[PDB]
Amino acid sequence: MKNIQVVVRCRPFNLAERKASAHSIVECDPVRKEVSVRTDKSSRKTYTFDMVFGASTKQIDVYRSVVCPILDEVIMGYNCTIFAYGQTGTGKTFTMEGERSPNEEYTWEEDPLAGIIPRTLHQIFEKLTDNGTEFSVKVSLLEIYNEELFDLLNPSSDVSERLQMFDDPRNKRGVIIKGLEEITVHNKDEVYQILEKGAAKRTTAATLMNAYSSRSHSVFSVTIHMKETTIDGEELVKIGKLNLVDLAGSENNINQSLLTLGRVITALVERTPHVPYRESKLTRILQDSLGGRTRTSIIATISPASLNLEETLSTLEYAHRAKNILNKPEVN
Template identity: 40%
Template sequence: GADRAFTFDHVFDTAAAQHEVYEGCAQALVERVLKGYNSTVLAYGQTGSGKTHTMGSIGTPSSAVPEAALGIIPRTVAEIFARVAGGDGELEGAALAASASFIEVYKEDIHDLLQPPIEAAAADGAPKLATLEVREKEGAIALPGLAMRPVGSPEEAMAVLSDGSSNRATGATAMNATSSRSHAIFTVSIELRLRGGKVLTPRFNFVDLAGSERAKRTGASGDRFAEGVQINKGLLALGNVISALCEKHAHVPYRDSKLTRLLQDSLGGNAHTLMIACVSPSDADMEETLNTLKYANRARQIQNKLLIAQDPVQARIADLLEQVETLIEC
């Protein structure tokens, strides 16, 4: 067919090291989070293309992974803690309090991966997990009952990721023996107290989307087929949201799926968002690769509305103190 051209900020080949991907993509978002902006990294692509490897969202403690193999999540979390501990510039004298949450969207149900299972694992090895409902609070998406675990170090954050990963839905398909059958969102929520009393409250979301491919290629049947239908439904809804935002529609269909509700702030909302399109170099995967590139190319056109995430009470106090100082100077 005809040649197609796509524009991206970076292109990494199969020889790219994990640190190169991190430095070329996600590292810049650390700076933005420490200035108070919400940030999101999404990994999108077909099953087996390296999404989970790139993100580093596997159920293995980072201490057990060779440094060269560490993905975006452990590298990002480590740099956030290191930057605050270093105390350079605006971060001099800053205090950091962080907590982590981990959820999955499985068959249009939102599961809290950090809550104990309601029922023990059945014969298929999948424990039954508690479901959460999406609520909207003061214009922001909320999940009442969501477990938030305090983390005081990168190691503690990775232990939370490891705990949650053990509950995540996986299953064998013809394309991947341990295919992720759910969309997963690992979130690090930060409270950063700066000198002078300013308190920033940004979040960093790491999104590992389930594989995007036709059921025929996965050889799926039974539960795997039903999972694939729901995965593609969520990804289709995400594609429709991306299209509506690119074309500046008055109505954006965020409510068409749980996935798009959860990503509402990241897509067209209040966050710096990076999409990593993972593709296969194989000729046999050309159609899936083309679809992934089209999807990511559209997402690149979205413009978010960025605001610093700040504790409203502390923001008001800081504003009043500034007014008092101005009056004293007068």
């Protein structure tokens, strides 16, 4: 019924990466939707994708191109998932979250470094406010490290108080995180405080665990309840859910969820009977995002530099096979 959308976003060279060559090692053609990696010397591999975003691609463009459509399907009542996959330092967190621009030069609302989450949560209150709907928005931020489950929006618990997971009685292909805080967002003003607090707790989590950013998987969920009255006089309810996932660096028990994600994707595309969803917290959590009833997009992030060429290639081969996975999306 529907393929997994795969897009690529390359970042500019960072201060560490040396550009030796006259012309690029990685080229991004947004018209042909291709990436070409130069690796003999006139020798290459070209990969085709659904969208391609080059080094100069601004945040607002990633949002417009990728998320605004997905946010329409969410409002129809589809479950949607976007995950960022790639090497540490390529821009997964910059894409899904973004960064904050110093000393109040921009309201969070206008910040050019703002990423998907903050923009998406702004837009929900604009789109839904005057589309006639009567609605509620609730969000949760969960992170997975060393197969353990940390809640970053819990206002009160020690961040080292980790949560449990069991199979959802009303969804053969999902789970429930017992105790996970779901915060009701009453309007766009409450959004910053909630996300700020979220990012603060993370900092705390970082001090306790080794290389936590790179090894952590982050799952931010927004859920929209929308109720409505039909011409026949009934009461139609639909539940949108959007999963914005920032994955552990492709390069990596610490790695069980990333390993298992690979094994799931491999199984799916090669059409093997057993897809081991159950072998990791992540793949148990996203089971439905990966050959199930969810609309899934991946944003594979890459470097343009020779230093990280091999992880870039890996990341390309890996995201490219994921286009072959078929989901069956369904609403309510």
